[PDB]
Amino acid sequence: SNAMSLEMFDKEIFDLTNKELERQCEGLEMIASENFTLPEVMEVMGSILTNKYAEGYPGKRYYGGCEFVDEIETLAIERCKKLFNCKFANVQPNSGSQANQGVYAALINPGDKILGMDLKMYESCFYGVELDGRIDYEKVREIAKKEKPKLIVCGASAYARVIDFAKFREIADEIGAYLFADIAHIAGLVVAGEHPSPFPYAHVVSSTTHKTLRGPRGGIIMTNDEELAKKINSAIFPGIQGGPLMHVIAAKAVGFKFNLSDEWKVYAKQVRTNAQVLANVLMDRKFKLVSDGTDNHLVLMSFLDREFSGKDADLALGNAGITANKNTVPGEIRSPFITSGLRLGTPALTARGFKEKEMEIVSNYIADILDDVNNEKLQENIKQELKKLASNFIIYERAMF
Amino acid sequence: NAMSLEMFDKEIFDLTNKELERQCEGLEMIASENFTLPEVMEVMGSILTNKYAEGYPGKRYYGGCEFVDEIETLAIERCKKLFNCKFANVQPNSGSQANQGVYAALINPGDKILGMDLKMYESCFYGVELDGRIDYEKVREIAKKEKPKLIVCGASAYARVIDFAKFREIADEIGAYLFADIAHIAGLVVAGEHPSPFPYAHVVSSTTHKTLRGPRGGIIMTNDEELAKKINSAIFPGIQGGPLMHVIAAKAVGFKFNLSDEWKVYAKQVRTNAQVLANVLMDRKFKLVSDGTDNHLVLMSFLDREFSGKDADLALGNAGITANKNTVPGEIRSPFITSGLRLGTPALTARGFKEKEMEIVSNYIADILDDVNNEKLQENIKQELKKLASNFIIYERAMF
Numbered sequence: 024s025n026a027m028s029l030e031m032f033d034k035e036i037f038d039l040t041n042k043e044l045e046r047q048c049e050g051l052e053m054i055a056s057e058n059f060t061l062p063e064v065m066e067v068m069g070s071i072l073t074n075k076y077a078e079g080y081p082g083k084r085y086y087g088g089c090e091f092v093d094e095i096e097t098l099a100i101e102r103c104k105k106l107f108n109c110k111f112a113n114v115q116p117n118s119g120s121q122a123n124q125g126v127y128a129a130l131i132n133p134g135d136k137i138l139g140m141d142l143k144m145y146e147s148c149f150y151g152v153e154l155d156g157r158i159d160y161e162k163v164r165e166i167a168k169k170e171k172p173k174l175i176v177c178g179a180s181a182y183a184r185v186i187d188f189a190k191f192r193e194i195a196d197e198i199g200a201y202l203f204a205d206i207a208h209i210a211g212l213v214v215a216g217e218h219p220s221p222f223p224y225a226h227v228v229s230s231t232t233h234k235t236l237r238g239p240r241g242g243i244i245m246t247n248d249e250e251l252a253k254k255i256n257s258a259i260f261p262g263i264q265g266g267p268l269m270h271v272i273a274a275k276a277v278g279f280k281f282n283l284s285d286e287w288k289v290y291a292k293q294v295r296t297n298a299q300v301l302a303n304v305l306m307d308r309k310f311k312l313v314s315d316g317t318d319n320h321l322v323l324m325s326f327l328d329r330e331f332s333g334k335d336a337d338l339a340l341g342n343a344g345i346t347a348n349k350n351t352v353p354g355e356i357r358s359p360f361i362t363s364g365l366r367l368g369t370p371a372l373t374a375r376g377f378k379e380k381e382m383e384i385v386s387n388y389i390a391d392i393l394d395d396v397n398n399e400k401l402q403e404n405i406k407q408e409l410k411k412l413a414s415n416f417i418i419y420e421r422a423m424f
Numbered sequence: 425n426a427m428s429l430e431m432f433d434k435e436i437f438d439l440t441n442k443e444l445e446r447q448c449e450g451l452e453m454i455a456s457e458n459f460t461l462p463e464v465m466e467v468m469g470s471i472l473t474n475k476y477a478e479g480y481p482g483k484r485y486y487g488g489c490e491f492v493d494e495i496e497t498l499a500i501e502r503c504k505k506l507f508n509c510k511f512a513n514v515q516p517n518s519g520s521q522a523n524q525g526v527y528a529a530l531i532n533p534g535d536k537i538l539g540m541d542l543k544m545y546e547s548c549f550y551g552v553e554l555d556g557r558i559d560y561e562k563v564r565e566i567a568k569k570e571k572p573k574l575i576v577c578g579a580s581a582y583a584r585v586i587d588f589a590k591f592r593e594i595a596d597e598i599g600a601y602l603f604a605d606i607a608h609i610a611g612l613v614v615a616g617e618h619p620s621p622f623p624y625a626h627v628v629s630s631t632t633h634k635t636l637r638g639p640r641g642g643i644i645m646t647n648d649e650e651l652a653k654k655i656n657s658a659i660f661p662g663i664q665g666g667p668l669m670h671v672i673a674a675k676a677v678g679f680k681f682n683l684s685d686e687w688k689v690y691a692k693q694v695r696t697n698a699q700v701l702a703n704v705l706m707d708r709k710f711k712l713v714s715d716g717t718d719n720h721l722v723l724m725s726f727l728d729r730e731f732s733g734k735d736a737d738l739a740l741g742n743a744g745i746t747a748n749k750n751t752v753p754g755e756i757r758s759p760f761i762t763s764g765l766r767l768g769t770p771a772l773t774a775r776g777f778k779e780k781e782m783e784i785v786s787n788y789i790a791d792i793l794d795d796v797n798n799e800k801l802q803e804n805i806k807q808e809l810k811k812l813a814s815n816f817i818i819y820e821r822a823m824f
Contacts, residue, residue: 026466026467026824028462028463028466029463029466029467029677032463032677032680032681033463033467033676033677033680035498036467036495036498036673036676036677036680037467039491039494039495039498039673040467040470040471040472040495040673042491043471043472043475043491043492043495044471046488046490046491047471047474050488052488054476054486054488056476057474057475057476058474059474060471060473060474062428063428063429063432063433064473065469065470065471065473066426066428066429066469066823067426067429067433067436067437067440067469067823068468068469068473068670069465069466069467069468069469069470069823069824070440070465070469070822070823070824071440071443071444071447071460071465071819071822071823072440072443073460073464073465073468073633073639073640074447074457074458074459074460074633075443076454076456076457085748086454086746086748087737087738087741087746087748088446088450088741088746090446091439091440091442091443091446092443094439095436095439095440095443098435098436098439117517117518117521118517118664118665118666118668119665120663120664120665121517121521121664124663128543132543133533133534133543133544134533143533144533144544233473233474239473240473240666240668240670263520263524264518264520264521265518265519265520266518266640268518268640270468270640273436273439273440276433276436277429277432277433277436280432280433280436281432337487338487341487341488346486346487346488348485348486348487419471422470422471423466423467423469423470423471424469424470
């Protein structure tokens with residue numbers, strides 16, 4: 024009778040949590056930025072580490088009694104350093120947003136200009152992608168030379184191709200800017216060698232730990248520069264946060280141990296392979312993909328040549344048990360609330376054990392639906408077939424660990 | 425249990441168990457510490473960590489949010505009931521993010537904030553007088569001189585009731601917002617053991633662990649619909665992305681407990697226990713800031729002593745009691761050394777201590793501070809306290 028105390032005490036929450044597990048098991052999760060956490064990561068999250076208030080850093084805490092949490096945090100930091108092969112890591116950020124805020128606070132001053140990708144504490148300017156779905160680095164260079172930002176940021180949620188960190192660094196160097204790489208969406212590939220590292224090109228790198236690394240939700244910051252490391256540490260605490268979430272930090276350490284394993288490289292490679300199958304099938308079925316394929320874990324479909332919208336596609340897929348998300352595309356002609364595109368990713372399906380054959384099956388069904396997007400009976404039928412298919416790939420026997 | 429973790433990552437498994445043993449064997453008296461409910465921890469280690477839910481219930485960026493929307497709605501509704509307010513935001517990742525959200529909602533970068541003292545905005549401060557209480561006329565003249573756009577009240581080491589009405593009167597005189605950060609007293613407030621900041625504060629923040637025994641995290645509350653909208657926008661997408669859904673479910677569970685009859689009993693015992701601690705220390709001839717307390721904490725002053733707050737903190741630590749050094753009115757030492765000691769009762773109360781046990785521990789504290797360099801006494805008391813602690817165990821395991 025697992026979590027029987029919760030069931031007796033707060034049956035509503037208990038029931039809702041099990042329904043969410045049922046939803047994760049029965050449907051196909053193809054939101055590019057989602058993944059399935061390890062049971063071992065979840066086990067340590069529901070722990071008495073939540074009771075410890077540990078403001079400061081290991082060996083340098085504000086309160087006493089931190090002998091064991093200091094060892095836990097040190098383990099997280101050391102594994103993070105090994106994973107990214109870097110000299111400094113901060114594992115305290117509560118989220119990707121706080122990680123990025125910490126980097127900004129460390130590197131620039133309020134009011135300073137940031138140049139970032141688009142697909143008031145600081146001044147923002149943006150670069151984007153061309154109609155062919157790729158960054159034009161000469162244009163970025165031109166934008167940088169005219170705007171003169173103090174900081175250039177790279178990384179994006181819906182970019183299907185390799186980010187050329189070396190070119191970004193060449194550009195930053197021309198105008199004397201810092202280069203900050205936010206690799207939250209591709210970090211799991213980076214640590215496996217399935218995407219080039221942002222080091223040594225980025226001065227500072229941030230990531231989240233759940234999306235691609237399959238750890239708990241949270242942020243991390245990495246650097247090789249000791250002075251920047253000190254500034255990052257101060258910016259996170261006391262600058263932006265108080266005491267860290269120690270149960271999450273322990274969870275991060277557990278996740279990193281998995282990321283360091285041989286199994287991780289196998290997983291990361293399969294993520295890319297699965298995305299290749301997804302892309303190839305959709306294109307063979309005569310759908311347009313932004314950039315005509317992918318280098319990573321995601322595909323972005325374009326419906327500029329089609330009858331239906333991105334929101335239409337998202338809702339049809341949803342009705343067939345497939346969770347994705349509408350997304351704007353280059354040459355966009357519709358409201359950002361409607362879009363003419365759909366983003367799909369493979370990390371979560373790969374995590375539950377889908378391989379090329381399963382990807383081909385799902386990809387063809389996606390195609391079937393979008394070939395007949397108004398046929399609600401077709402969606403119902405596919406929903407049942409997919410629930411059956413998914414029943415062979417169950418990674419969670421329970422909702423709480 | 426947690427056998428899978430034990431097999432996969434023995435180092436983390438072992439360290440987590442050692443931390444459990446430390447919490448069991450020691451006497452936790454850091455005023456801001458507490459013990460989370462087992463039921464809260466159960467839902468924290470759940471598959472809700474897997475859902476990305478940017479936005480608010482019924483208005484998310486992603487589909488598939490049917491069930492997490494119902495969870496967050498439940499947390500919001502329970503929070504509104506607990507604080508008797510018309511709007512709540514339960515997404516803040518921490519007290520720090522909650523407060524940043526409030527600043528971002530109410531004022532502009534560079535604007536001035538007046539807050540309590542013991543880059544984005546300008547900060548000014550008021551403090552406490554030698555008698556250990558806020559002089560509200562002094563606060564008023566600071567406010568008139570500085571003209572902040574926002575006044576903040578709430579403090580981590582203030583032992584007396586905060587006069588929210590007077591703070592609002594001061595704010596009104598200068599056309600400022602009043603923000604009450606009640607993280608350190610929220611558990612007393614929701615039980616009626618401290619006056620509510622509403623309707624005096626425009627916006628109220630709190631954390632969910634310290635005094636409410638929920639998970640670590642933040643919340644924001646208001647009665648003003650226009651401010652609620654600004655608050656929600658500030659939190660997302662201003663300050664955060666996706667919320668921690670496993671934590672939001674945990675906050676909901678915690679609120680359910682806070683709403684129960686047992687909560688009021690707990691909160692009253694917290695105050696009673698703090699009265700015992702205060703009375704014993706003063707009977708033993710120690711000075712307390714403001715000569716007592718109205719809440720969960722006491723602040724000892726050592727201006728009349730040869731040892732520092734740091735010395736006291738280390739002496740208690742050696743005897744197995746966790747506390748923290750703290751500056752005091754009339755402070756004469758570095759703030760990294762201090763002339764005081766903050767002590768609180770929430771954690772000991774949570775594990776079942778009542779008056780009799782408080783009297784034992786308070787007299788041990790007095791014994792130590794009467795002979796601060798007596799290392800053997802500390803060792804002996806540590807032994808006695810471990811025995812006392814063994815009779816008050818609330819966790820049978822480290823992971824739920």
